[PDB]
Design an enzyme around this catalytic site. Structure first.
Site, mmCIF file in Angstrom:
data_model
loop_
_atom_site.group_PDB
_atom_site.id
_atom_site.type_symbol
_atom_site.label_atom_id
_atom_site.label_comp_id
_atom_site.label_asym_id
_atom_site.label_seq_id
_atom_site.Cartn_x
_atom_site.Cartn_y
_atom_site.Cartn_z
ATOM 1 N N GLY A 95 0.578 -1.459 -0.431
ATOM 2 C CA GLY A 95 0.234 -0.064 0.345
ATOM 3 C C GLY A 95 0.400 0.974 -0.209
ATOM 4 N N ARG A 96 -0.019 2.260 0.499
ATOM 5 C CA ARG A 96 0.936 3.629 0.783
ATOM 6 C C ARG A 96 0.108 4.313 2.046
ATOM 7 N NH1 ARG A 96 -3.859 6.382 -3.193
ATOM 8 N NH2 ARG A 96 -5.110 5.054 -3.149
ATOM 9 N N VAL A 97 0.996 5.487 2.564
ATOM 10 C CA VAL A 97 1.466 6.357 3.570
ATOM 11 C C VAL A 97 0.778 7.584 2.857
ATOM 12 C CG1 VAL A 97 2.422 6.871 5.079
ATOM 13 C CG2 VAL A 97 2.213 4.783 4.841
ATOM 14 N N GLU A 142 12.124 9.201 7.470
ATOM 15 C CA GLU A 142 12.354 8.132 7.819
ATOM 16 C C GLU A 142 14.229 8.076 7.889
ATOM 17 O OE1 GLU A 142 11.863 5.985 4.003
ATOM 18 O OE2 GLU A 142 9.764 5.975 4.413
ATOM 19 N N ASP A 201 9.973 -7.159 9.922
ATOM 20 C CA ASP A 201 10.154 -6.251 9.390
ATOM 21 C C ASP A 201 11.275 -4.456 9.008
ATOM 22 O OD1 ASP A 201 10.985 -5.419 6.512
ATOM 23 O OD2 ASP A 201 8.768 -4.167 6.175
ATOM 24 N N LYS A 212 13.928 -2.391 10.050
ATOM 25 C CA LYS A 212 15.411 -1.677 8.543
ATOM 26 C C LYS A 212 14.906 0.485 8.621
ATOM 27 C CE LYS A 212 11.240 -2.169 5.246
ATOM 28 N NZ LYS A 212 11.272 -3.097 3.762
ATOM 29 N N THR A 248 12.966 -8.122 4.482
ATOM 30 C CA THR A 248 13.263 -7.586 3.480
ATOM 31 C C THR A 248 14.846 -8.156 3.399
ATOM 32 O OG1 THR A 248 12.504 -5.273 4.101
ATOM 33 C CG2 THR A 248 14.139 -5.582 2.463
#
Ligand SMILES: CCCCCCCC
EC number: 2.7.11.11
Lengths: 337, 20
Positions: free
Chosen positions: A42-44, A114, A153, A155, A188
């Site tokens: 999806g997307r944010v 991030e 996940d 990272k 990942t």
């Protein structure tokens, strides 16, 4: 004191886990502003809640796309877990709902960007800088694993920096509540533990392996196992060999040797003494765990803030329509969402 | 250098999750 914290944390969690919140807002209550990212799936989108004027980061999943990617159970995991947890270094879920087409999770907006962005630009973090972030991850996994959760996940892409310079973990798309072993190939490439690559049943030790990868990548500026293609990364991971930069301290290298340990009866996090093998290691001797938890330690850096709603700490992404069909899609598959 | 090898590689941007 730690035990007493975690007992209380668990009763709080189980109450929400057994009785999940559903349908706590609607799309029309938010103004869509800008895409902040893509996650596991999806997307944010940055959105503004009209009734309060608060900004939030709204993850949007297309139900039909989730089904095609065989992510139905993982998505129900994500939302059920996120609505039940509560910890300083986890991004908080404020609202969730669904419409004919999409699923929505409205999270706290963490404007600092991030870690990934900051790390790539600067090149690498200093050992004290890396240790500050690593400590927060150690406490977060202590919390999560105590709730029988595996995150799967870890990272820099999933680690957002808040206005105090502390981390918030985002994207729970592979998080799962499991006692004992599980088998799904997910994560990942660079962060996968050998037992995942080799299709063995695995446990929360995969998260501690991933912590090793992260500390390495933060302190070196590149991951311990890299190549142009995933298969070549996997051959490196299962080889049993790692090289450290000459600038890594002897205490850092010893920590990493025990985290990036292919042998599960020797991997830190996974022995009789649990997380204490990590928390008590020499690399962390200057770390005051409680002051980290309380956010009383001075952060390595504070993200630039230009205002409410500013996204300049985030990359630009192609904007896509939020389309809502007049027909309900996948209603049974997502009924509990 | 290892850094140069990394920067020249195809995996210095945001990395996607895998699944089967
Ligand atoms: C007295 C507060 C201790 C906090 C430790 C948190 C463990 C995850």
């Amino acid at each position: 004191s730690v035990k007493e914290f975690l007992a209380k944390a668990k009763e709080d969690f189980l109450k929400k886990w057994e009785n999940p919140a559903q349908n706590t807002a609607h799309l029309d209550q938010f103004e869509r502003i800008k895409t902040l990212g893509t996650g596991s799936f999806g997307r944010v989108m940055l959105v503004k809640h009209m009734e309060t004027g608060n900004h939030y980061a709204m993850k949007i999943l297309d139900k039909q796309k989730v089904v095609k990617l065989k992510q139905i159970e993982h998505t129900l995991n994500e939302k059920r877990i996120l609505q039940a947890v509560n910890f300083p270094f986890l991004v908080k879920l404020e609202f969730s709902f669904k419409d004919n087409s999409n699923l929505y999770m409205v999270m706290e907006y963490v404007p600092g960007g991030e870690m990934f962005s900051h790390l790539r630009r600067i090149g690498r973090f200093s050992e004290p800088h890396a240790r500050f972030y690593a400590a927060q991850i150690v406490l977060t996994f202590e919390y999560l694993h105590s709730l029988d959760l595996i995150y799967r996940d870890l990272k820099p892409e999933n680690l957002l920096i808040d206005q105090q310079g502390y981390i918030q973990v985002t994207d729970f798309g592979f998080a799962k509540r499991v006692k004992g072993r599980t088998w799904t190939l997910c994560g990942t490439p660079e962060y996968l533990a050998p037992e995942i690559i080799l299709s063995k049943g695995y446990n929360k030790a995969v998260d501690w392996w991933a912590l090793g990868v992260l500390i390495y990548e933060m302190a070196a500026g590149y991951p311990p196992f890299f190549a142009d293609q995933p298969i070549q990364i996997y051959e490196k991971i299962v080889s049993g060999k790692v090289r450290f930069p000459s600038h890594f301290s002897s205490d850092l290298k010893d920590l990493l040797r025990n985290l990036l340990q292919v042998d599960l009866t020797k991997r830190f996090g996974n022995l009789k003494n649990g997380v204490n093998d990590i928390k008590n290691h020499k690399w962390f001797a200057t770390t005051d765990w409680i002051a980290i938890y309380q956010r009383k330690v001075e952060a390595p850096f504070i993200p630039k803030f230009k205002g409410p709603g500013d996204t300049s700490n985030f990359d630009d992404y192609e904007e896509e329509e939020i389309r809502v069909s007049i027909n309900e899609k996948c209603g049974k598959e997502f009924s509990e969402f | 250098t290892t850094y140069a090898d990394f920067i020249a590689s195809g995996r210095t941007g945001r990395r996607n999750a895998i699944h089967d």
